[PDB]
């Protein structure tokens, strides 16, 4: 089981077919809880994104692009849409689980 | 139920959460067989993509842009884009996918 963070989900991440995926819209509390750990693989490359999540979840990610390829049992966490004030200002958080 | 034709899949297309989708990579034969039908809903807005599909499947779609909103049981057929359109399809950068929603 590996767990990724990105700004979107794409069909291009899936390796095996046919594949079942469960998708849920989650709140900021759930989102910050599950991304705040050592094993999560960050694939968000825009700094403004990286700041937005570091501000709202009090984490320390650095902009790091990776081409992620999801396998059975992998999880993907997605944020969709600076300084503190701006970040507080529209945003959604999703959880994607592969089977 | 509704069946769409698109050039992308997006989380915003889903109406209820949590939701499950089954995704399959299909070949040209199954793709063209499933979109060559009366009640399909064409969401593709570019002419490049639409003549490419028509060339390949022998269909006669038109550039029609729509906001897709998938509910339970709806199906989506996607042409996934990873001179300009021909380069991608013959570079091995265009693939075809079946998405059934739950």
A55 to chain B, closest Cα gap in Å: 24
Give B32's Cβ-side CA count (13 Å radius). Answer: 13
> How far is the CA of A13 from the CAs of A48, A58, A67, A72, B14, in angstroms?
23, 28, 8, 12, 19
Where are any strands of DSSP class E within chain B? 3-6, 19-26, 40-42, 75-80, 95-101
Q: Crossing angle, helix A28-35 and helix A47-56, to 10 degrees?
A: 100
What is the rounded distance in angstroms from the CA atom of residue A63 to the CA atom of residue A43? Answer: 8
Q: Could you tell me the two tokens for A87?
A: 């970040």
Of B19, B25, B82, the CB nearest to A23: B19
Fold of B1-102: Rossmann fold (3.40.50)
Q: Could you tell me the two tokens for A41?
A: 């693989």
Of A11, A24, A25, the CB nearest to B80: A11
CATH placement of domain A1-99: 3.40.50.11170
Q: What is the 3-state secondary structure (H, E, C) of chain A?
A: CCEEEECCCCHHHECCCCEEEEEEEECHHHHHHHHCCCCCEECCCCHHHHHHHHHHCCCCCCCCCCCCCECCCCEEEEEECCHHHHHHCCCEEEEEEEC
B24 CB neighbours in chain A (<8 A) are 17-19
- Is A22 close to B24, i.e. CB distance below 8 A? no
A29 phi and psi angles, rounded to 5 deg? -55, -50
What is the rounded distance in angstroms from the CA atom of residue B12 to the CA atom of residue A38? Answer: 29
Resolution in A: 2.2
- Alpha-helical (H) ranges within chain B are 28-35, 47-57, 84-90
What is the rounded distance in angstroms from the CA atom of residue B2 to the CA atom of residue B37? Answer: 12
What is the rounded distance in angstroms from the CA atom of residue B23 to the CA atom of residue B76? Answer: 9
- CA A82 to chain centroid, in Å, comes to 19
- Is A19 close to B23, i.e. CB distance below 8 A? yes
Chain B residues interacting with chain A (CB cutoff of 8 angstroms): 9, 11, 14, 17-25, 78, 80, 82, 95, 97
Of A19, A20, A94, the CB nearest to B11: A94
- Is A24 close to B14, i.e. CB distance below 8 A? no
């Amino acid at each position: 089981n590996k767990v990724y963070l990105a700004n979107a989900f794409s069909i291009n991440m899936l390796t095996k077919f046919p594949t079942k995926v469960v998708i849920d819209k989650i709140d900021r509390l759930e989102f910050c809880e599950n991304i705040d750990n050592e094993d999560i693989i960050n694939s968000i490359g825009h700094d403004s994104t990286i700041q937005l999540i570091n501000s709202l979840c009090g984490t320390t990610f650095q902009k790091n692009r990776v081409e992620i390829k999801l396998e059975k049992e992998d999880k993907l966490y997605v944020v969709q849409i600076l300084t503190l004030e701006e970040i507080l200002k529209k945003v959604q958080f999703f959880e994607i689980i592969v089977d």
